[PDB]
Amino acid sequence: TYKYVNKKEQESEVDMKSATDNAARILMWTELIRGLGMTLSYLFREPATINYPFEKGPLSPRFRGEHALRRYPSGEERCIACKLCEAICPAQAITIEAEPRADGSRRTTRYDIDMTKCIYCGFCQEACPVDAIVEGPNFEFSTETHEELLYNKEKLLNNGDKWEAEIAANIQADYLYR
Amino acid sequence: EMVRKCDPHIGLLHRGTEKLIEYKTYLQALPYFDRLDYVSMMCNEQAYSIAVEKLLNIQPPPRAQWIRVLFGEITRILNHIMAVTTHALDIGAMTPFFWMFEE
Amino acid sequence: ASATRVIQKLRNWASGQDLQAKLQLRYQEIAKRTQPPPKLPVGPSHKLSNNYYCTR
Amino acid sequence: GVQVSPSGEKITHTGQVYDEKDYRRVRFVDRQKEVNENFAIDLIAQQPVNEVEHRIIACDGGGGALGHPKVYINLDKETKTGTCGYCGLQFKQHHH
Amino acid sequence: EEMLTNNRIWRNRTVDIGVVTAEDALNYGFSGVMLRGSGIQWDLRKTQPYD
Amino acid sequence: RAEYVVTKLDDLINWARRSSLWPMTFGLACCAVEMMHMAAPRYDMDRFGVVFRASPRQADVMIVAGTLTNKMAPALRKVYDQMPEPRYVVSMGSCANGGGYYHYSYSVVRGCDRIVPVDIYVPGCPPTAEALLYGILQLQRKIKREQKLKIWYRR
Amino acid sequence: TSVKPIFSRDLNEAKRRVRELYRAWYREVPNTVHLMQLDITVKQGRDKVREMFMKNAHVTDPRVVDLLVIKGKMELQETIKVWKQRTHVMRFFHETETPRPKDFLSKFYMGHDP
Amino acid sequence: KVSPPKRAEMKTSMESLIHHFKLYTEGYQVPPGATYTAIEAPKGEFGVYLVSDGSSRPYRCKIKAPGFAHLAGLDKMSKGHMLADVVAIIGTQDIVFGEIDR
Amino acid sequence: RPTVRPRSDVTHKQLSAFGEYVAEILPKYVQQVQVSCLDELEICIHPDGVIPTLTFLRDHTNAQFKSLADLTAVDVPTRQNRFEIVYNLLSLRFNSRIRVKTYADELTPIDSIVSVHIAANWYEREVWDMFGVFFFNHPDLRRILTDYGFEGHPFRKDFPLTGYVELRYDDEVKRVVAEPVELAQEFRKFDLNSPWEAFPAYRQPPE
Amino acid sequence: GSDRSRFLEGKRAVEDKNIGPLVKTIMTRCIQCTRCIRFASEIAGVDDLGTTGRGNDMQVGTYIEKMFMSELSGNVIDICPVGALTSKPYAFTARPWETRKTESIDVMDAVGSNIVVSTRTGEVMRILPRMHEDINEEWISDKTR
Amino acid sequence: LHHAVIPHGKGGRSSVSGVVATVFGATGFLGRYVVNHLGRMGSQVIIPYRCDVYDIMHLRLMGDLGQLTFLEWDARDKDSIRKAVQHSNVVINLIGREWETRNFDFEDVFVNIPRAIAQASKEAGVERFIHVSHLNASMKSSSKSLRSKAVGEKEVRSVFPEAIIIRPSDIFGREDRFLNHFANYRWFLAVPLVSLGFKTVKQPVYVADVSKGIVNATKDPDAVGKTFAFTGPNRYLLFHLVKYIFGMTHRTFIPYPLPLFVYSWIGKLFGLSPFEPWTTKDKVERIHISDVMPTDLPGLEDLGVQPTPLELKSIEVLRRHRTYRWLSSEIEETKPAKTVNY
Amino acid sequence: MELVEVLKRGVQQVTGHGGLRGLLRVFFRANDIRIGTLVGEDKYGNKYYEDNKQFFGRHRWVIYTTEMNGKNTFWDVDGSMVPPEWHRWLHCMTDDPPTTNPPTARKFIWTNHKFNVSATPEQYVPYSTTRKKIHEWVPPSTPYK
Ligand SMILES: COC1=C(OC)C(=O)C(C/C=C(\C)CC/C=C(\C)CC/C=C(\C)CC/C=C(/C)CC/C=C(/C)CC/C=C(\C)CC/C=C(\C)CC/C=C(\C)CC/C=C(/C)CCC=C(C)C)=C(C)C1=O
Ligand SMILES: NC(=O)C1=CN([C@@H]2O[C@H](COP(=O)(O)OP(=O)(O)OC[C@H]3O[C@@H](n4cnc5c(N)ncnc54)[C@H](OP(=O)(O)O)[C@@H]3O)[C@@H](O)[C@H]2O)C=CC1
Ligand code: SF4
Ligand code: SF4
Ligand code: SF4
Ligand code: SF4
């Protein structure tokens, strides 16, 4: 179906009272006064502004923030050097050079994520088969140099150790959907 | 002040999206469509998804289709809010911009 | 929501419309941020029988 | 456990320390080289061996879906413990 | 709508501005909102529905 | 003591320049959509004293918000150069930081720091408006740390 | 053998179009240098135009010569307007980059490049 | 073989893990062919002309943006008008330049 | 089958009948007519008949395709004419879509259809800018998406993804200057092709 | 194959072997296809590999602790379709989608066998054989591998 | 060579050139061009600074992702100098002032700081030390700055015996203090030259030429203790040079003979300033000291740099100082200055 | 009436922050005068008040500590000074503060939170964890033979 937005059905003819009403609308600026009243009501409403650094904006457990490498409860790193997160990374922001460790486990030696190249899409964390790489809730990690956003494995493991008390709770609240 | 000719030079946001898409896989090329029209992200995603679904000869489940329509109309409200309020901002009024941007 | 009766009357008259019924600040009617865990259904082709891939 | 090079900088869990004559230490001059103190190899070395009864033991990471893919380890060799490939957990058959 | 639609300043700014005929819109291939603004009854959600 | 008076005067001028930050009405893409979401009533930059000005002559910080194309780069450099002297640059989003999703494109400058000196990098694609406000406050702290009069006095 | 021409039947009128384009560029160089505040002189710009024509001056296919004329007309049009800026018109000179030397000793001293 | 399985099924099943691995490394192979899919986007008819050569990467992806045609028609709409109504016409055309430039 | 699309053999038959109709109306130019299993009609014509074919489809009474949806090019650099120019046309009267294909090489231009559809102006500018396909009788044919001094046509298959030059600010000349491209990362190509064929319906006969 | 599993039981597991410093054996993922057995019997001709047991318990390898070290012994790593027999020096370093392949020839043997050098990020990662029916057929020797 | 210093990589801006260099006057005027050339060819550049990070912001570009390491330093802190130079093949010294402050005078600036930098470089075992002196800073000169640069040249030679010593002439370029100084003479009534600008011969040299010479010196197999004279290709009288400057500026030109005694008085009056002085007594003395003929010293020609003439690279400096009437004038609108030989 | 009740809530807010010094402290640090239920007091000194009568977004807030990790954060309040559990509660991913539902304790979790350390000596600098991948040669120390 369809409807008209500006077409009128027939006409209301010409009448003295309707003419006086239109004349008063033109001369007395009635729609302008109406708009004044609308923004006056908005003046007397309560603003939606939050006090920013003390009241943060609401979020969700699915939120994609700063990347982190997680660990098992034993303390062993979850990552098993399988590289499919960098295979699925649409920006080619991950570099996963790897070799067998001293105990023979399959681990990484270089895990770099270029945060200036990353598009923050979560494909790595939804591709990871062991929940090693995650995108935790940190978003206030702006830096004063370009180099500080070129993360390596030490930086990512430090972020994982820093945010594990929140990342684990979010994954607990979220994993039944994914 | 009268305009005799308009010549819009574009390409100052041309980033070779089609070439990058042909260099990446389908799931990798999906979030480019979020950035084509960055006011109707779910709508562009739906367009690309329906194209790939038609090529794959598969159909999404009915719950997925209803969610896609719901977020399609959500994108439509977002885009028409943006269009109307920024049009009014270019005309000269900014209070509808602030109200509908809270929404 | 925390406005006096005189200010509410002034807002309603100035706007021309009732504002307390549809005010644009969310107070308590929204969902709780902590939700019970879900149990998502499995779709078709989880049948364990008569489910060969060549037929679908 | 972090160690200190004779140059002075710390050694990561993949020992990659810059040499004495390597110029790439001005990046650490007036700044720091951060090394994750919790070495996963030591943390998994100090984990005890699980005594189980069956010849084949199934391993997750400790959760149904929060762990790793569910694998099976065969503990037929009495000389060595069976280590799961995803975690570093070791299992030994309780043959008594 | 109350702030803009009946406002005479907005009406003087928008009415009879950028008038596109239906035939010109079809020839220029606008196809989105300019068609139904010029009166062309076309919407893909009604004519070629997908979901 | 001249050091104390110079330090307090420098703190005063840093307070003025950090309480009155006028970014330019200049964006490029989805990151600029989040920039005007930072202008939105929720995270009121005007409450912070941050208010856009259209001309670069009345601007203080360029918020590079979007993909800096090769065709765009002379325009961005000219606009930055046309600012008056105490000027800052906040790169916003992966495109302005290091190219991002279009890093290997033939037409994209791999980071706006190849073109203009960047003061603060804000990561994200897009960074949230909260994150951009975080970068703005971090810039305010950065220019609070500046000691121009003290460096002049010991010069 | 037996191809379709685009503007020119043979090489003579292709060279005629080349001469017309070169005349237009030669006339436009002083106006470009005056309008866009170029560091170069009029002699340098005309020598650069001659250099570009010379580096394209080894092709004997009429279609390719016509396409080069068309692209040169497009470049001349965006130089007639100020669509090209100072940076765009100074990109022809390569004032920043150091040219790679043509001798085997230098190309052996630096890089594994032929 | 098109959608990734659930994570629990991926961690407990062999076929699910194989398909997770292959979808997140290579991706699904789209059978070769070309389509033009048009969707009523809010700014207009948003079209994708997809050409697939049979591999897991698209051979060609043309994006038809409505704003391209609208801005091509901007000069026709701006006849007998001034700077202010040219600004109005730019506003009334639903224009975003990411989709126009691609 | 809840995971497979429906077929619509009725609209497949309708498009086949209309393909026969156009192919017998214009035998001078039509080289091939095909209808896909996705119910899309493609008509592959000689490049000389672009203007008559597009005019017939613009205003014929039974074929009112007055709206031009898309005009693009596909670079297939293994055939003799390496560019396939594709027109996607929309019929609002009959609620249909048609696709018209023609071919070109680097030295064979195609007549522009600006006299038929005005959107073809910018679309053919984009085709020329991205593929180097010249268009006859085009008003102000020039670049539309590349940089002003850009050399080469980047949507071609032989053009590199990163291009040949990159821009940076140089303080000595106080300009934005162009340099030969030097990546600090070197985009890693991935060989994501399975050595087993996936679709036996498209198995080509051996050479 | 299908897209799902109907298997609701526990999977078997096989203890690993120590066949040599070149071939790492994770025999849990062997599919009992006897390709290595046929190769080592016919081409390499050592007759050291075989099947011990019956049924689902049938295992591939040597019954004793045997050091399977002959020339042409990485070709079991080549012909094993699963990752039961992998290359110990090429342990966990790269992936095939990562590796760029350059088709070259071999030195330190005057046969001049055709090889593929799999590099990644400017570093030689692996040497695979090529197919030349007149020189080396499908396989190469241990020294060149 | 250590493996990270091998010059592998074509060209610059993303390659390794093995020219790890600590540039000490990088925050100034010649230093920005030197840092630009080093970062263009692709090199580790350590910049010790004492001004504001905002004042070094313009140097934060022209280096590719950590190729430029900025660190604070103090001229009275040997530990700061040592930590600046301890990882460097090459140390380049560009420290200088055109005036004297309350903390640092000419003797300290041109003697004590270069000696401390050379001593720290020698103790850290750097391979090359390039030190920028001035041409005709020989000895017994009329100005204190030239004598101080001579004494510092001797001190750097004594501490670091194989230090390259580069003596340019009065360097011209954008944001210089030579062409911009003579163009800023327009703000007064006339141009006060000594002896009407005659008997004073100068051959100014371009900034890009000097910086290219410094980069070719830090890569050159020769120059292991040599002294270079970086001069322009043409020698001009001072009157003809100032007349050419005002011709390119298109302002006006009224010269005025002023004796050097009262001109030094006026220079001292201008130099009495807490900010950067517009001119000083040492500045006018160096203005009216003639350049020496570079006879036996090598220069840009055998360091591989073609000296660009001022008549070529002059419009990019003096176009700022024109009015709107003469802003769009080319090179040919101004006749070149007469070149003397002497 | 309503006005006197508003004035009563106003004087409650004025005389609800301890004393005049506490009122001025919260007014010149947090730029608001509000009374909320104390639910926080974390280990670093952040306060974490809440008030469910306010609308969504202003119903939870933190008064930051004046000192954290040696930095005088009286005026330089930072968004990264919140430890992760209070970060989750403050950003409203859950309705449960980490006083009734504490997070799971692990030995590798940081016992001390660090804020944004950019432009500080404790900032992050990237490396190349590579171990050089190439060993050149060592010429002998004995001259000739
Ligand atoms: C889809 O496509 C796209 C677009 O399309 C729709 C885009 O748009 C687009 C670009 C997008 C952007 C650039 C985003 C930017 C955001 C917006 C455009 C929206 C935000 C809103 C606005 C810009 C409107 C703002 C509206 C307002 C009402 C704010 C008010 C602003 C003002 C300028 C007016 C108020 C004045 C001031 C702030 C300053 C006033 C103060 C002074 C000048 C001080 C002067 C006083 C004195 C000198 C007094 C001194 C005298 C004394 C005596 C004092 C004594 C002193 C002592 C020390 C003693 C992109 C990229 C895009 O993709
Ligand atoms: N420019 C010319 O015309 C000529 C110059 N020279 C010489 O070449 C050298 C470089 O020239 P130029 O660029 O013009 O010089 P500048 O005037 O630009 O200053 C050079 C650098 O010296 C630093 N500096 C000065 N005094 C001190 C100090 N007390 N402690 C620490 N650093 C200090 C400055 O740092 P900051 O900004 O922090 O103060 C600046 O970065 C100088 O030695 C100069 O004498 C020789 C011939 C001609
Ligand atoms: S979020 Fe996306 S772009 Fe970022 S690292 Fe993960 S896969 Fe790559
Ligand atoms: S982070 Fe996960 S997906 Fe990436 S290599 Fe490690 S285990 Fe694989
Ligand atoms: S970083 Fe992401 S959100 Fe920002 S401009 Fe680029 S594509 Fe858009
Ligand atoms: S070749 Fe591999 S899969 Fe086949 S029997 Fe041998 S070890 Fe098992």
Ligand code: SF4
């Ligand atoms: S990659 Fe192949 S061999 Fe390895 S575990 Fe998977 S199915 Fe088995």
Ligand SMILES: [K+]
């Ligand atoms: K194998």
Ligand SMILES: [Zn+2]
């Ligand atoms: Zn395990």
